[PDB]
Design a protein around this ligand. Structure first.
Ligand code: CL
Length: 167
């Protein structure tokens, strides 16, 4: 669960030139170490690729803010530090409320770099998507991102991760 030894990472987010603030996230390395490590390394950029300058390409109010397509920047791409895809590590954490970080996928064992931040409980994603962290500060920034979304997910401003890293 939450723990002092878990890594902490951040995104600084902008919407068409407007600063939205910083999201700070704790990653459950103690539950899903491979999945947490992937996300952490993508935040620092240490493998030579990562989340910096990527966008939130799909935002559905009352559901998710989705980003992490670092290879195509449109929802069709993504890549992990382990290759194009990696396994669903476990489903020990459920989608019990807002502010959870969960891996996007297109089927079993197809995790890459795409992720969502939840805006609500989502039981239907349990045993389907791996939850690997939570927003510890900056949920206000997440609600700003939500404000630019729409029912089908298109966004009215380009929402970018202008800086990111590990605390
Ligand atoms: Cl302890």
């Amino acid at each position: 669960g939450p723990h002092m030894t878990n890594p902490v990472v951040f995104f600084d987010v902008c919407a068409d030139g407007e600063p939205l603030g910083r999201i700070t996230m704790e990653l459950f390395s103690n539950i899903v170490p491979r999945t947490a490590e992937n996300f952490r390394a993508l935040c620092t950029g240490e493998k030579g690729f990562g989340f910096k300058n990527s966008i939130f390409h799909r935002v559905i109010p009352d559901f998710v803010c989705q980003g992490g397509d670092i290879t195509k920047h449109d929802g069709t791409g993504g890549q992990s530090i382990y290759g194009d895809k990696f396994e669903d590590e476990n489903f020990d954490v459920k989608h019990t409320g807002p502010g959870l970080l969960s891996m996007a996928n297109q089927g079993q064992n197809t995790n890459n770099s795409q992720f969502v931040i939840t805006l609500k409980k989502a039981e239907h994603l349990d045993f389907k998507h791996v939850v690997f962290g939570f927003v510890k500060d900056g949920m206000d920034t997440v609600k700003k991102i939500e404000s630019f979304g729409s029912p089908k997910g298109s966004v009215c401003r380009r929402i970018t991760i202008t800086e990111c890293g590990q605390i």
